Design a protein around this ligand. Structure first.
Ligand code: SF4
Ligand code: SF4
Length: 80
């Protein structure tokens, strides 16, 4: 899964992009639920939140180096 840096500007521009509602608005920065973040697998080819993030603050979470299989499985548990 991914997570948000402290460079987050809280522009909120990423919430729409997320297909799993894994981003929660915070203060000073936003927080991603590693439980809901499938890195967009099962939805897109690239994580959508990054495509609109100006601060470039959504790195890979070393605490959760999941596999596409795992990620794909996480995706389903959330929708179908
Ligand atoms: S789009 Fe980037 S800066 Fe803006 S809230 Fe999301 S993570 Fe932070
Ligand atoms: S990488 Fe995809 S799944 Fe994870 S937080 Fe961003 S938009 Fe949601």
């Amino acid at each position: 899964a991914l997570y948000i840096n402290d460079d987050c500007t809280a522009c909120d521009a990423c919430v729409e992009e997320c297909p799993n509602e894994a981003i929660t608005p915070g203060d000073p920065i936003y927080v991603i639920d590693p439980t809901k973040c499938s890195e967009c697998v099962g939805a897109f080819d690239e994580p959508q939140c990054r495509l609109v993030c100006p601060a470039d603050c959504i790195p890979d979470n070393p605490d959760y180096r999941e596999t596409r299989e795992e990620l794909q499985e996480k995706y389903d548990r959330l929708h179908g």
